[PDB]
Design a protein around this nucleic acid. Structure first.
Lengths: 123, 171, 134, 62
RNA sequence: GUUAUCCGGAAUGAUUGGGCGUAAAGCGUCUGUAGGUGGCUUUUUAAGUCCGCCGUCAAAUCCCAGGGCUCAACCCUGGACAGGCGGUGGAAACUACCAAGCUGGAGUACGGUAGGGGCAGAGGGAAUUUCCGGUGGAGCGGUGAAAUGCGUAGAGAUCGGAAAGAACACCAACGGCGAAAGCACUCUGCUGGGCCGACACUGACACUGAGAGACGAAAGCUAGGGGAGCGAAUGGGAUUAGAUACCCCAGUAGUCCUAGCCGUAAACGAUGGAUACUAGGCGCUGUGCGUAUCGACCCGUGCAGUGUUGUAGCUAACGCGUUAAGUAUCCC
């Protein structure tokens, strides 16, 4: 790439920081409607039953979001609040569900790091 | 075989030692898969006197001190004219690790990557800033700084080499 | 006789002493004559001699050395071009660089003649930076 | 001598062309004809770059 | 604290600051338009460039220094480097310009010189197959071993007679030429290109090349010939559990030629082109000078090209190394 004419045509441009969440497309976290609350398995090295809610969003997408924590109240057609963040083990799950927010209760009996799970103080 | 190596260790006030990485490097044999320890030790007093050294042995501490005995026969002196900083900027690659060194104001502690910062904080320089361009390696990095501070000249020996009598210098 | 008459001399310098040979033969144009005139007097080289071969006046230039070493010259010469043909560079009397604090010089084309940083910093003039050596 | 180069290349293209058109498949001398056309063409842009009237005479001669 | 958005880190789009032998990456090679860069000397204008002065780039923000709120945040007063554009006065080294010379770059003229460079026309002989004769009589051919096949309608073998197409043994060399693909039986014709010398001439006419144009192994296709060998597909036999395959026997398109189309290949040196510079040894090819003889040698050399080990330097390493993957410049 000489300074003359292969480069005052253009070098090229890198695209963007590609969006790591194609939904949520305004901004960070977005209200959701539960459609399925099924349970899938990770890839080969792990072994678990991870419990994800496939959730329709208010944006216009439908997307399978993970449910953190131990206990979960989430039945059919409830309302959640999804956020970004890639669960590695599950192919397709791109998102999380916030706990302690609207119609998704905090986890049962947790006393270490409660702000990630929406549990008020005991004691 | 006199014992306990008290006089023979030479208590190392003169050269202070640190590792900069101890990677376990392993070879496989017919019987299996056995490892030795490669440690990289940078020795040097804070007077301006440092040098790297690799070593590998099946023990950790014999690899460290073995790399030290390899290191304390490999010393350059640092051309560091002013108030513990550098004469001029420099860059010198070794292998595929390029190192840009740049002198600093005296109100600046040494800021560099871990291998470069290790061989400069052992070099007793206080005021430098060296970016590393290239490898993630630690050995060729540090040895590239050593080559990057051999080839560095003061003003007195450049004034001696050119023959110009003296000016153009604040101090 | 290629595209550049200044990478001519300069690349003959680098290629001269990187093979440790202390002798250069180059053409003697006006700007080469001026560069070796402002370069012998700055302690980098030893002597420049004009002569002729087929009535074509050339410069043979003797480089510096020291004594019998691993390499008989210690300080590697490190010549470098800046204002390439096709990318001209130009500086005021502000931008004009003190190379390594002053251990190098930046030979450059003033309206006076071609100077160094000493002889263009005191003038206050600026111009096209040919090349800086260090 | 320039007009002997242009005129000499013109007779070169005449004799090589009346070779090639009655022959029609030599793909080696095609390069010779095209190097002669390009070489002559850079000469004509050269003498046109120098002069007006004199290059007008070079056009009017052939 | 998590998330989202942006910059950094990221030299991970590179002017500062990357690469293209093998890691991602050099077009298949070549001609050349636009365009880009460009030899030396002398002179002229100053468009670029530089210097002075002047105008302006609102205020707020940022920077410096003061001052005010108990400090800070914030507020306020004054100041300015950059840097942009314009006006004006100066400088002329570099780019450009104007003019005039110059030759080493490049060509041409001339004399040689080497060549499987290309195309066309003639001519050649081995060998193979088939046919036609004479002989003779049971196998020939093939394989890891067999078999299918052919053979008493006389095979194969041997001698002679024709015809046919295709390719051109030894020479053949780590060799010559072409831009690449390619090019070797010989001869002729037309014609390209290279290399070397003398100043014989012109005087920078140069390099690269977007888009473009040409050529471009083999297989493929249209049209017409031709068809011995070989031989996809196919068919039979074998091996095999099976065999659409390797083996064998037949064998069609194709192979060759005319006129086209197609435009791809590991089109490979896995290396775009050009110029300048940087150890040597051992070679080969072409010419040139001197020695030696007076003539073939033979030695050194001046160049150009081709090869092999190899210093420096580069490289992640392997390696490359005057034909660089070295040092630099230009262009895609």
């Amino acid at each position: 790439m000489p300074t003359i004419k292969q480069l005052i045509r253009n070098t090229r441009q890198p695209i963007r920081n590609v969006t790591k969440s194609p939904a949520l497309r305004g901004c960070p976290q977005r209200r959701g409607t539960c459609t399925r609350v099924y349970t899938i398995t990770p890839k080969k090295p792990n072994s678990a039953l991870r419990k994800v809610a496939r959730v329709r969003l208010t944006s216009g997408f439908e997307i399978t979001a993970y449910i953190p924590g131990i206990g979960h109240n989430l039945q059919e057609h409830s309302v959640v609040l999804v956020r970004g963040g890639r669960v590695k083990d599950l192919p397709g799950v791109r998102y999380h569900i916030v706990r302690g927010t609207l119609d998704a209760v905090g986890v049962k009996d947790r006393q270490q790091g409660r702000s990630k799970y929406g549990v008020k103080k005991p004691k | 075989g006199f014992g306990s190596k008290s006089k023979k260790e030479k208590i190392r006030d003169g050269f202070e030692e640190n590792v900069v990485q101890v990677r376990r490097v392993t070879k496989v044999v017919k019987g299996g898969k056995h490892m030795r320890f490669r440690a990289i030790v940078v020795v040097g007093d804070k007077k301006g006197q440092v040098g790297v050294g690799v070593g590998k042995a099946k023990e950790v501490v014999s690899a460290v001190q073995k790399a030290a005995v390899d290191a304390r026969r490999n010393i350059i002196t640092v051309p560091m004219t002013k108030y513990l900083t550098f004469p001029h900027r420099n860059e010198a690659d070794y292998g595929a690790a390029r190192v840009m060194l740049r002198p600093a104001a005296p109100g600046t502690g040494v800021i560099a990557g871990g291998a470069v910062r290790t061989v400069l904080e052992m070099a007793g320089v206080e005021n430098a800033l060296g970016k590393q361009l290239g490898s993630n390696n630690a050995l060729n990095n540090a040895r590239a700084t050593i080559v990057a501070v051999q080839t560095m000249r003061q003003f007195s020996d450049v004034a001696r080499d050119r023959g110009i009598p003296m000016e153009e210098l604040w101090k | 006789m290629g595209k550049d008459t200044i990478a001519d001399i300069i690349t003959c310098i680098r290629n001269a002493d990187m093979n440790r040979k202390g002798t250069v033969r180059i053409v003697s144009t006006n700007i080469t004559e001026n560069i070796v005139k402002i370069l012998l007097r700055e302690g980098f080289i030893e002597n420049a001699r004009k002569h002729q071969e087929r009535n074509k006046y050339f410069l043979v230039l003797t480089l510096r050395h020291r004594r019998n070493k691993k390499g008989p010259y210690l300080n590697t010469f490190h010549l470098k071009r800046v204002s390439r043909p096709g990318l001209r560079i130009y500086s005021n009397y502000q931008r004009i660089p003190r190379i390594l604090g002053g251990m190098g010089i930046a030979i450059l084309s003033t309206s006076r003649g071609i100077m160094t940083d000493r002889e263009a910093r005191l003038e206050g003039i600026g111009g096209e930076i040919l090349c800086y050596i260090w | 001598s320039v007009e002997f180069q242009v005129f000499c290349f013109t007779n070169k293209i005449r004799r090589l062309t009346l070779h090639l058109e009655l022959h029609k498949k030599d793909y080696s001398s095609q390069r010779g004809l095209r190097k002669t056309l390009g070489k002559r063409q850079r000469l004509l842009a050269y003498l046109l770059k120098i002069n007006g009237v004199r290059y007008k005479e070079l056009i009017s001669k052939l």
